[PDB]
Amino acid sequence: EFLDPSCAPGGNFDLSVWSLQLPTGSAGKVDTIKSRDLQGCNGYTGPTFFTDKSNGELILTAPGNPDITGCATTSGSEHCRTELREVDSATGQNTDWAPAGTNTLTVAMKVIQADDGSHGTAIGQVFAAAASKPLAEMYYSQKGDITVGVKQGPSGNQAITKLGTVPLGTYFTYIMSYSDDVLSISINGNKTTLDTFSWGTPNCYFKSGNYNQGKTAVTSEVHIQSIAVVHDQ
Numbered sequence: 330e331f332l333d334p335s336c337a338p339g340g341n342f343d344l345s346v347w348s349l350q351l352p353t354g355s356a357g358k359v360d361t362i363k364s365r366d367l368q369g370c371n372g373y374t375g376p377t378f379f380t381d382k383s384n385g386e387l388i389l390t391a392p393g394n395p396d397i398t399g400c401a402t403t404s405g406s407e408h409c410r411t412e413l414r415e416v417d418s419a420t421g422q423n424t425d426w427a428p429a430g431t432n433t434l435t436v437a438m439k440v441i442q443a444d445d446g447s448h449g450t451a452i453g454q455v456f457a458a459a460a461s462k463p464l465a466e467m468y469y470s471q472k473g474d475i476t477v478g479v480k481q482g483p484s485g486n487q488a489i490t491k492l493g494t495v496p497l498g499t500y501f502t503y504i505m506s507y508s509d510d511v512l513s514i515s516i517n518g519n520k521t522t523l524d525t526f527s528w529g530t531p532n533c534y535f536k537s538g539n540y541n542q543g544k545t546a547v548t549s550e551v552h553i554q555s556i557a558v559v560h561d562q
């Protein structure tokens with residue numbers, strides 16, 4: 330369970346359940362690293378996704394407002410990211426799951442610099458594949474306030490709930506759960522059950538990393554110490 334400073338992230342974390350979306354791109358489409366290329370001690374590394382040479386942890390950076398920085402955005406988004414997108418462990422293909430049974434994402438993270446978006450940097454998501462929209466988008470502000478925006482059904486705006494406060498530079502553990510049709514997030518074991526409004530049990534998938542919401546060019550920086558996905562149906 331010791332991370333290896335000499336390995337790429339694929340040697341220190343199970344990246345067989347992830348692909349990586351980057352803030353660079355070509356043809357207005359962002360570069361994506363397939364799971365097969367992330368995996369292993371000799372897997373992908375780049376300028377925004379690399380191993381901390383002091384301790385083996387994962388460092389993810391992302392640039393601010395693309396209108397200023399020129400960074401690449403996914404379709405439908407106006408913000409740049411270095412962010413992991415869940416895939417099927419067997420095939421490497423994009424996946425999603427029903428919120429029946431148990432679906433959790435547990436991450437130990439610290440934020441070194443957050444962006445100046447309304448709520449700060451997005452550090453985890455439950456994405457509703459069924460509506461091509463986020464169900465829950467968790468944010469970390471420059472004051473260390475952790476919040477979540479939950480769309481009021483697929484056509485509604487995000488309702489914001491405060492989840493906790495953690496000072497910048499301090500490690501914390503989050504758990505995002507959408508299980509037995511109940512959405513909840515815990516921060517250091519403090520659990521908040523969240524209203525899902527008019528959402529009709531959408532198929533979803535997890536995202537985790539650094540999705541920079543900045544109004545200005547401010548960079549964001551996230552470090553990850555552990556990341557685990559559980560599906561038990």
Ligand SMILES: *[C@@H]1O[C@H](CO)[C@@H](O)[C@H](O)[C@H]1NC(C)=O
Pocket residue numbers: 492493494495516517519
């Ligand atoms: C969890 O709740 C306790 C008790 O209200 C509080 O002292 C602590 O700051 C909370 N944790 C976070 C990360 O906000």
